[PDB]
């Protein structure tokens, strides 16, 4: 079994690209933000890069971000930018190459649901004058980068409902097929009733989620770090609340 924390992401310093994925709503951003805050604590510098056509990076930190990286207020180490990339993904590849030439030690990508993620992958494995070679080559490289387990992983985020877990299975399975490494699941928005507190809803709710949780661990227990974030009463926004939240990523919540 495996420590239910992202300590390993912190420890694996070769990591250059960390992708965060999951169904809509599960808390992809909240996590990306959290994760980068934690990494930024033990790296030379960290870039938080969001591709949502709209961007919730700024909304997350109540600070205007842009296609121009900048320092996240309250950190001197963390930066964030918000951009907009059979060929809606050539442009996407270029960003990476260019961005990979920047001096940020680690990059945490926040991205539009597997739809476009999964579509990018679909790409290398589909393509199969020197401006033909030259492009492809450039994918070749990127692609190797993705499959290089020292350089790239995926973090899966989900909640304990049917559709979310299902998609998490498919995703884990795709990444495998593509040979992209993944070894972390973040199960978010867990309702932990308060102890000695009897609530029908509260109880029954934990009852149903727990039936998912159980399954998640029985299945990924041994080759995934399965973190478990609690559902908070307020949204997780602003430097403060995100930092607190993020601690739970690294050292397990257990009430």
Ligand X SMILES: Nc1ncnc2c1ncn2[C@@H]1O[C@H](COP(=O)(O)OP(=O)(O)NP(=O)(O)O)[C@@H](O)[C@H]1O
Q: Which residues are catalytic?
A: 52
The answer to whether residue 188 forms part of the interface with ligand X (CB under 6 A) is yes
Residue 29 touches Mg ion, criterion: CB under 5 A: yes
Distance in Å, CB of 194 to Mg ion, minimum: 29
For the CB of residue 235, give the shortest distance to its own copies in the complex, in Å: 5
- Contact (CB, 8 A) for 19 and 155: yes
Structure tokens given for 1: 């079994």
Phi and psi at residue 99, to the nearest 5°? -60, -30
Nearer to its own copies, 11 or 200 (CB): 200
Cα–Cα nearest to 112, from 76, 84, 135? 84
Instruction: Please report whether residue 34 would count as binding its own copies according to CB under 8 A.
Output: no
- Residue with smaller CB distance to its own copies, 88 or 221: 88
Longest dimension (CA), the chain: 72
Exactly one of 9, 22, 28, 92 binds Mg ion (CB under 5 A); that residue is: 28
Residue 24 engages ligand X in binding (rule: CB under 6 A): yes
**Segment lying near ligand X (by CB under 6 A), choices 4-12, 18-26, 126-134, 168-176:** 18-26
Q: Which of residues 78-97 bind its own copies (CB under 8 A)?
A: 88
Q: Quick one: which segment of 45-53, 66-74, 100-108, 198-206 binds Zn ion (CB under 5 A)?
A: 198-206
Q: Which stretch binds its own copies (CB under 8 A): 40-48, 97-105, 113-121, 246-254?
A: 113-121
- CA-CA distances (angstroms) from residue 87 to 100, 122, 182, 202? 20, 11, 26, 48
- Out of 42, 69, 202, 219, the residue judged to bind Zn ion by CB under 5 A: 202
Q: How many residues bind its own copies (CB under 8 A)?
A: 36
Please state the closest distance from residue 221 (CB atom) to Mg ion, in A: 27
Residue of the chain from 1, 76, 115, 196 that contacts its own copies (CB under 8 A): 115
Q: Torsion angle of alpha carbons 205, 209, 214, 217, nearest 10°?
A: -150
**Does residue 100 bind Mg ion (CB under 5 A)?**
no
Between 102 and 204, CB nearer to its own copies: 204
Query: Is 255 a binder of its own copies (CB under 8 A)?
Result: no
Residues 60, 237: Cα–Cα separation, whole Å:
5
List interacting residues with ligand X (CB under 6 A).
22-30, 52, 56, 113, 161-163, 188-189, 229, 231-232, 235-237
């Amino acid at each position: 079994s495996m420590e239910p924390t992202l300590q390993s992401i912190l420890d694996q310093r070769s990591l250059r690209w960390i992708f965060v994925g999951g169904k809509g709503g599960v808390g992809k951003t909240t996590t990306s933000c959290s994760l980068a805050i934690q990494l930024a604590k033990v790296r030379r510098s960290v870039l938080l890069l969001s591709t949502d056509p709209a961007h919730n990076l700024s909304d997350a930190f109540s600070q205007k971000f842009g296609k121009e990286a900048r320092l996240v207020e309250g950190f001197d180490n963390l930066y964030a930018m918000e951009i907009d990339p059979i060929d809606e993904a050539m442009s996407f590849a270029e960003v990476l190459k260019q961005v990979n030439s920047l001096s940020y030690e680690t990059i945490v990508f926040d991205t539009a649901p597997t739809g476009h993620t999964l579509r990018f992958l679909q790409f290398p494995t589909v393509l199969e004058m020197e401006k033909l070679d030259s492009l492809r080559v450039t994918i070749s490289e990127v692609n190797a980068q993705f499959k290089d387990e020292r350089l790239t992983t995926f973090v899966c985020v989900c909640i304990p409902e049917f559709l979310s877990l299902y998609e998490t299975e498919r995703m884990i399975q795709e990444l495998a097929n593509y040979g992209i490494d993944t070894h972390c699941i973040v199960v978010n928005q867990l309702l932990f009733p308060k102890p000695g507190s009897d609530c029908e809803q509260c109880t029954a709710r934990r009852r149903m989620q727990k039936k998912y949780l159980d399954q998640i661990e029985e299945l990924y227990d041994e080759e995934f770090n399965v973190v478990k974030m609690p559902l908070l009463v307020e949204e997780v926004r602003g430097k403060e609340r995100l930092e607190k939240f993020s601690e739970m990523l690294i050292k397990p919540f257990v009430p």
